[PDB]
Amino acid sequence: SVTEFLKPRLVDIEQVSSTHAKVTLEPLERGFGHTLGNALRRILLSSMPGCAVTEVEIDGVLHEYSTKEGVQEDILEILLNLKGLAVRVQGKDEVILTLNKSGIGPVTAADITHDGDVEIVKPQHVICHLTDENASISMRIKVQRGRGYVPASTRIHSEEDERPIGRLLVDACYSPVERIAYNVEAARVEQRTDLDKLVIEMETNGTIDPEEAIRRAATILAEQLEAFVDLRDVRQPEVKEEKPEFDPILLRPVDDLELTVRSANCLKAEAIHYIGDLVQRTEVELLKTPNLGKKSLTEIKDVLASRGLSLGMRLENWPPAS
Template sequence: EGNHAEITLDVTGPCDVLASSFEVPGTVELVNPDFHIATIVDKVNLKMTLTVRTGRGYEPADLRDDEDRVVGALKVDASYSPVRRVSYTVDNARFEKRTDLDKLVIELETDGTLDPKLAIEHSATILQQQLSAFVDLDAIAEQEAKKDQNDFDPILLRSIEELELTVRSTNCLKAESIFLIGDLIHRSEFDLLKTPNLGKKSLNEIKDVLASKDLSLGMNVENWPPVG
């Protein structure tokens, strides 16, 4: 019931006592039925009742208060953690021509009740929650995302008037809500040719001016248009 259950053992040797030798209620799952408990070499009877509980971390027996403990019962330390062993190393790493990078290698072994990948993910979540007492990591991530979203080449944020196109070409572009150079390079030649009063001559003028600035029509600028 609740967070604990009783499992029983009643075997007679000689035999190997395994986890599967225990009788368990339906609320208990044996993760490793082949786990070796003991070896009985003589024809003797081994009988015991164990109380298993759910918990977290490590709990010394002397810190656990069992008011309803049966006389003669033996209390043992409890280890609830599914992680058996964890270690890490920091190795040198290389990416393209950079050789001054580090690589974190984590080795983690569990008892099989928890996938190691999930254990690392859960640990990272706990670490983030603990650090939130000092800094709001979510707010920082949001600010960085907003910064990246608006981190455009300054030339893209300039008015198309700075391209010094003819008045006719400039007015045609503004009529199509093209006010910034970034707006212009996002359009294709086909899009511009559909603009009223903007012919092939004006298109070539626009292409030549953009080319002089290492730009062209039909360019893909991520996160364009800018927000705010």
């Protein structure tokens, strides 16, 4: 009784506005008030799944340092405003929105071409100001989902992303929580005293729902705590590995090599679906195919062999797993 105390629960999701929200957890025995409050504040501020804009491309732009006859703000200000946009997506983990406007007016959020799953949170968010009469802005916006925050240059993966000069890279700053205050107070509970009703107030982007964010943060915290809820000598290092030598290409099919679909159906019609079983396909066992000229054979030799392998090798590792 005096030990093995009770446990809290979420009793209210009172939202004083569309953004400012308040939740009340109760009860907390003692000290758990400040403890849980600070811990949840840290978790919330740190990592909540956001969905801010990450990529844009406009027609007339060649670099974010340009201008565009007709729009009041410069391109860079449009980038900053876009970054300021707040949106939620539900099903997918990324989406490509489109915004087309023409004529004088303040181009705002709601004037984009929303899909069925994407949902703007506040319409009057000003994106730009079309001030010339027959000015036209048509832009595409890749909006993705992630965790935490990431700058622009740190997103570099290859050179094809920057290949289209129209690519503009806004630094994604998605974290639906903007400020998180909390405080405890004496809860006039059923029969006890000094049980602490904790109140958490959150100013957020209207992207995340209060109870949603609370339960997501609680799951994160409970899982990360579970890592040493039964801590031990789990220490990782090991040695003397025996690895399946075959390259993962062999598991993959032909279409995992960027080949012409004609040669794909050709090796279909010549008993080739895997890649570990087309290396078990002699060189005479390829050109017999219905209607191989050189082009389909070009793709074959290119994405099968010329990438490092042969057009059929007498190998004896496959199958080690199939």
